[PDB]
């Protein structure tokens, strides 16, 4: 079975070096091509550059020309990218994948990179105070660093109109996540809401009630 | 500057049929190379589903197929399932500076379930925050479909792109989709303003919710 695998997910921090890899297996690696692409968060694939393992002949995309080394050692059947000086920017999905007869037939599984300049840090708990007689509330769950954090709702009794969004990597190199629930606006001061916060790179537990406005 | 040129989206329903064209210059496509086509789902690494021009690897279902002529590069598939949901890209060899080059992509929306417009919903900076030294404005956009919104945030009238994280949509438990768009801001930035907007846009109609320092 043609398979290419790649070195695990990065956490690195802006001006590090990194080189991560991508190893063939069941055919001749010499013999044809590997690529690598960039998709990051959201948008295109993005072609960085490609090599030729026999003669170790490499080309690149302009966008990518002197900011990456793509190289390889056929001998272990493995290729190559590498930064010298990370960029915050560069923050990415990384693909391998090989150029054969059917063109990009075989693709590396993907390596993660996450560059920030952030270390491990503890999320600030903001309350987001409150449509067909419901209300909307939630907890801002501000700057923290790495993934993951998790969310629950008053200790998780609170399941229903629940969403707990995504996270934003910030230009910062921080997270920042919401988690937001729908609920009765007759309950509101009756009923006591509490999102629970748990972080645990940073070994951070908060509890915030969230309370109505009143004006 | 070899370029290759899709359509941001295409859309339609369970059974139907859609096409997705790729369009090239003359160092790409003109020069006679033949385009690819490339299938990635959610969370996933892309699949090869079309190789010179027209050919299917095995497993690939004969519902896919692809074409091109002269300068343009078409992909169809018919019969269209949920799982068929995706983004699409053509690619293609060139002579140019770059050796390979891929087109901007396609995401395929399969309208299995009604279009709705979404829910705004915009906080304003906490006081917590703010005695923090800090400001976010927090814009919560809910149960919408398709899963694509545009967000723009106003200062007053004026359009504001520093400082403003946007997340992709994703699932909501009930199916439908949400996303939240955040503008940060300098305790005095939001002060100083008469107030800030967040402006959704989903299917070409613009929902907006506005917040003011002076309110309550």
């Known amino acids: 079975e043609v398979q290419l695998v790649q070195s695990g997910a990065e956490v690195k921090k802006p001006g590090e070096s990194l080189k991560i890899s991508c190893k063939g297996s069941?055919?001749?690696?010499?013999?044809?091509?590997i690529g690598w692409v960039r998709q990051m968060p959201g948008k295109g694939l993005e072609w960085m550059g490609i090599?030729?393992?026999?003669?170790?002949?490499?080309r690149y995309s302009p966008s990518f020309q002197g900011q990456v080394t793509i190289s390889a050692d056929k001998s272990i059947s493995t290729a190559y990218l590498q930064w010298s000086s990370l960029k915050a920017s560069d923050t990415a999905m990384y693909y391998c994948?090989?150029?054969?007869?059917?063109?990009?037939?075989?693709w590396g599984q993907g390596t993660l990179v996450t560059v920030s300049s952030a270390s491990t840090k503890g999320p600030s708990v903001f309350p987001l105070a409150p449509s067909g007689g419901t209300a909307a509330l939630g907890c801002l769950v501000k700057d923290y660093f790495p993934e993951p954090v998790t969310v629950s709702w008053n200790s998780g009794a609170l399941t229903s109109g629940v969403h707990t969004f995504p996270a934003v990597l910030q230009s910062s190199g921080l997270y920042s996540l919401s988690s937001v629930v729908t609920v009765p606006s007759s309950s509101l001061g009756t009923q006591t809401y509490i999102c629970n916060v748990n972080h645990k790179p940073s070994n951070t537990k908060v509890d915030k009630k969230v309370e109505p406005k009143s004006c | 500057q070899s370029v290759l040129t899709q359509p941001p989206s295409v859309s339609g329903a369970p059974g139907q049929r859609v096409t997705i064209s790729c369009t090239g210059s003359?160092?790409?496509?003109?020069?006679?190379?033949?385009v690819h086509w490339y299938q990635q789902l959610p969370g996933t690494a892309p699949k090869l589903l079309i190789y010179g021009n027209s050919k299917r690897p095995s497993g690939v279902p004969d519902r896919f197929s692809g074409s091109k002529s002269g300068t343009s590069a078409s992909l169809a598939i018919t019969g269209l399932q949920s799982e068929d949901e995706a983004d699409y890209y053509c690619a293609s060899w060139t002579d140019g500076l770059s050796l390979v080059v891929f087109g901007g992509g396609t995401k395929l929306t399969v309208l299995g379930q009604p279009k709705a417009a979404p829910s705004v919903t915009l906080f304003p900076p906490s006081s917590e925050e703010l005695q923090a030294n800090k400001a976010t404005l927090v814009c919560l956009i809910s149960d919408f479909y398709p899963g694509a919104v545009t967000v723009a945030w106003k200062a007053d009238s004026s359009p504001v792109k520093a400082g403003v994280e946007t997340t992709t949509p994703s699932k909501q438990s009930n199916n439908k989709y949400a996303a939240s768009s955040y503008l940060s801001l300098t305790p005095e930035q939001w002060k100083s303003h008469r107030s800030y907007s967040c402006q959704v846009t989903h299917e070409g109609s613009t929902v907006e919710k506005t917040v003011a320092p002076t309110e309550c």
């Open positions: 994948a090989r150029w054969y007869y059917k063109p990009f037939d075989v």
């Open positions: 090599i030729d393992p026999s003669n170790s002949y490499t």
């Open positions: 069941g055919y001749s690696f010499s013999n044809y091509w």
């Open positions: 003359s160092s790409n496509i003109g020069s006679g190379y033949d």
